[PDB]
Amino acid sequence: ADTHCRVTADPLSLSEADAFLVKPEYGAQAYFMGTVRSPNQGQVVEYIDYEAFAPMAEKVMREAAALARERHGELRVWIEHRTGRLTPAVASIVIGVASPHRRPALEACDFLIEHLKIELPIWKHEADGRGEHWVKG
Amino acid sequence: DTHCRVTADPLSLSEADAFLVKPEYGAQAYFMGTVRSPNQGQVVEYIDYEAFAPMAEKVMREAAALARERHGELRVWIEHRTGRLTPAVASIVIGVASPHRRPALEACDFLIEHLKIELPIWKHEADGRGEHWVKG
């Protein structure tokens, strides 16, 4: 009830995250959104194919949320990752954290994005003109 | 590349997102501050926010320029709301888009801490302890 962790093919929405996180007792919400970038360090990309097994990815998310709470205290946590072929400027991940005060929310969001970049079992194939290749990045 | 506004109308995350997202900016970081109840152990009925709108928007644009000095290329969105705001209503929204994630996250964090100090915005929380306006 204080945590939302979902892997989905549907578009990710900040407004849905906001609808879940904001409560009168939580004066602060901090977000991160990752979207597909069109010149990736001097390379032109037209799509990225994301793969995730929802049960294993969501179990990682819920463990991430509990680690964030261990470090930063009371939180509401929103984590979603999108699957499928994603065109540029389309969101692949949304992370949102609400807390009584701003500094815990900012730190918890920061922790989650760095933690999930390491621990999330996501596999992706980028369209660089260099064939199909699936990487755990 | 920069949007800075003081308004009495509701603040919108989805409006910030519409302004920020561009194909070359793969990362966006946001902060929203909402009216908190209870606060310091007492129920808050509302917070009256008052701002010198032209002065405050100039501070916002200088803050966005300082953010770029430290973190490079950015799209920056800053809005602050004025008037009588009830619990869970947003008083400030900050959004930053950058090519990569570290500058977006740290620039957003920089902006909220910077603006907490420099914004000419005065508030009065109605927490039942009389009138008391604070630069907070």
Author numbering:
A (entry chain A): 9 to 145
B (entry chain B): 10 to 145
Task: Kindly provide excerpts from the paper associated with this entry.
Molybdenum ions are covalently bound to molybdenum pterin (MPT) to produce molybdenum cofactor (Moco), a compound essential for the catalytic activity of molybdenum enzymes, which is involved in a variety of biological functions. MoaE is the large subunit of MPT synthase and plays a key role in Moco synthesis. MPT synthase is a heterotetrameric enzyme composed of two small and two large subunits encoded by moaD and moaE. MPT synthase catalyzes the conversion of precursor Z (cPMP) into MPT via sulfur transfer of MoaD thiocarboxylate.
DrMoaE structural data with a resolution of 1.9 Å were obtained, revealing that each monomeric protein consisted of three α helices and six β sheets. The α/β structure exhibited a hammerhead fold containing an additional four-stranded antiparallel β-sheet domain. The r.m.s.d. values of 1.19 Å and 0.981 Å were comparable with the Cα atoms of EcMoaE and MtMoaE, respectively, suggesting that DrMoaE was similar to its homologous proteins, with a high degree of overlap of the four-stranded antiparallel β sheet, but a displacement of the α1 and α2 helices located around it. Compared with EcMoaE and MtMoaE, the loop between the β2 and β3 sheets were predominantly disordered, resulting in their apparent deflection. The anion pocket of substrate precursor Z (cPMP) bound to EcMoaE was found to consist of His103, Arg104, and Arg39, which corresponded to His109, Arg110, and Arg45 of DrMoaE, respectively. The His109 and Arg110 amino acid pair of DrMoaE located in the α3 helix was equally capable of forming an anion-binding pocket with the Arg45 of β2 sheet located in another monomer, which matched well with the MtMoaE protein, but exhibited a significant angular shift in E. coli. In the dimer interaction interface, the two anionic binding pockets in the dotted frames were symmetrical to each other. When the corresponding Arg110 in D. radiodurans was mutated to alanine, the gel filtration result of DrMoaE shifted from a single peak of 34 kDa to a single peak of 17 kDa. The DrMoaE dimer disappeared, suggesting that Arg110 had an irreplaceable role in the stable dimerization formation of DrMoaE. In conclusion, our results support that DrMoaE possesses a conserved MoaE protein structure, with a more disordered loop between the β2 and β3 sheets, while the cPMP-binding pocket Arg110 residue is a key site for its dimerization, which responds to the oxidative damage process in D. radiodurans, and is thus able to reduce base damage and genomic DNA mutations to defend against various external stresses.
